[model samples]
Target: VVIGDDGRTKVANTRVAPYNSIAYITFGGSSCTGTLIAPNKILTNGHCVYNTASRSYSAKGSVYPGMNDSTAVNGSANMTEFYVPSGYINTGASQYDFAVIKTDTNIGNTVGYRSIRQVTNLTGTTIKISGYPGDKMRSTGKVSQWEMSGSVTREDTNLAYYTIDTFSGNSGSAMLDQNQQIVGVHNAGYSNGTINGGPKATAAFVEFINYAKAQ
Candidate 1:
């Protein structure tokens, strides 16, 4: 029951608060999902947390936020810190895949804070893909919504792609347009080869979220 655009109806988990970064490369459990943007910052998808077993990843208190149903909800406010961006996950797949998490308190006026913009020059647009996608069918993890109209292309030299129709808890969330601004953060889902790459957002990740809010 989370409707906006004036019609108001928010509730379920409040605003955008479902960041659960805690990984060690395809492991037991963690790598859940993420997205907070400011007031501490959070906008994941650097291979979902890149943590090849202590090799790195998962710091800032292991990261965790608003989480609800997706997990941790008792008292909330996890995700102690984060700021991965030495430049596109150490230049692996290469596509401007970004990450920037940091939570511990002050969720910015409380939830309702998803701005972060910068597209430069897109290709035909019309976004809107809020998160918490578990149920499917236009999504239904409570505060879910979908409506993709593609255009932005160029999957190379950094990153750029957007097919539409997403799934799997809609990673990272945020992909605004039509005034809302933001344009990317849907991370992963494009493997016409099989799967992965339907929502890849990264315009230098808005300078890694303004240099992690100027540190």
Candidate 2:
């Protein structure tokens, strides 16, 4: 995601709930963000772990939960497996940008996890996003968590659009409601448009999370 108006600010610490659930994902030489939704499961963007063209998953990936500038507040783990939808593997559309990853360790037991709820309508409702961006202070030691909150301009069963600021590595960051339930995932932003957003959580999406969590 690209910063539309640059309203993001640094998260004070990564040693707390929800914040600790946020993870810095490194896979196949690329980086993105993710949120833990279960003891061993994480919610992220399909593109973060799968290649639509190659129709393959990343060879390997590392999940650092509660990372604060290279430090893991709770600890880190390796991604063992992941689940993505055929809609994304087949069509690669914005609406299908979803994925659930399984880690080898129960990191969430220590870092904490967030629950996801199907939110069909988020229009005008304020939402929050926090993740690791690849730009700005992308330097290794300087990299840390950042956040932004804004009101949703529009939304549907497929997606939610807003002016919230984000950047390269913010993809897969969860868009959270006041209750801290995930409403959407951060997957689009490179688009040069005034608005940027990601796939909304539908009933099927919530079910998929359950499917991945138990796996």
Candidate 3:
């Protein structure tokens, strides 16, 4: 997650096996991290899939589950649709800065999925995040995924600020709690003028996932 610390090493397959639900989303001449939450559903940042300025979703993209060394180790899925909160249009609220993607492949069936949760009072708790950092791309220009650990230092009603060292392309990475369940979605960093943080899973956010699950 840190840009050049060499502290976050490459995620091994063994470590990736349990968290194979994580994904590397490539589109719009850019990339962002994501997670598979259902058979064909991907959870990521709204900005990753949508062009707010243009008011449109990227025409196409691919989701690579269990991606390693910049390659989709298991398989790849073509994204079909991008869904965002209705409020996203009027307000680019960080709380609503999320998107659910429908993929053509049943990637979750192969790599598996994780359950998301709404949590609170998590200040001072350690969290984890793994993602494809653009700064650490491999020689082949493929993603080099890495994981980092940090503690939540502050919390508000909608977000949990953390000491995690994340960078660009790490957006949409799942912020996991000690139980290894998703507690938040990694988005922006330094809003606190020091660390990384993102939208905490709230009731509305949980409902959004449920809606995507049903679709």
Q: Which candidate has the top score in lDDT?
A: 2
Name the candidate, 1 or 2, with the larger lDDT value.
Answer: 2
- RMSD (Å) of each candidate, 1 decimal: 15.5, 1.6, 2.1
Q: Candidate 3 regions off by >4 Å?
A: 1-6, 14-16, 138-141
1-215, model 1: which lDDT tens digit per residue?
12222221222532333222211111134443455556666665665566533546643443334544334442345565566777555663435555666666655445444666665545556565554444442334433233344445444434455555555555555566666555666666655422224334445666667878766
Worst 10 residues of 2 by lDDT: 135-144
- TM-score, predicted candidate 3 vs. hidden true structure: 0.91
Model 3: worst 10 consecutive residues (lDDT sum): 1-10
Which pairs of residues have clashing backbones in candidate 3?
70-143
Q: Write one digit per residue (lDDT tens) for candidate 3, span 117-137.
A: 777667987888888877777
Model 3 scores a C-alpha lDDT of: 0.80
Clashes of each: 11, 0, 1
TM-score of each predicted structure versus truth: 0.29, 0.94, 0.91
List ranges where model 2 is wrong by over 4 Å: 1-4, 139-141, 190-192
User: Top model by TM-score, which number?
Assistant: 2
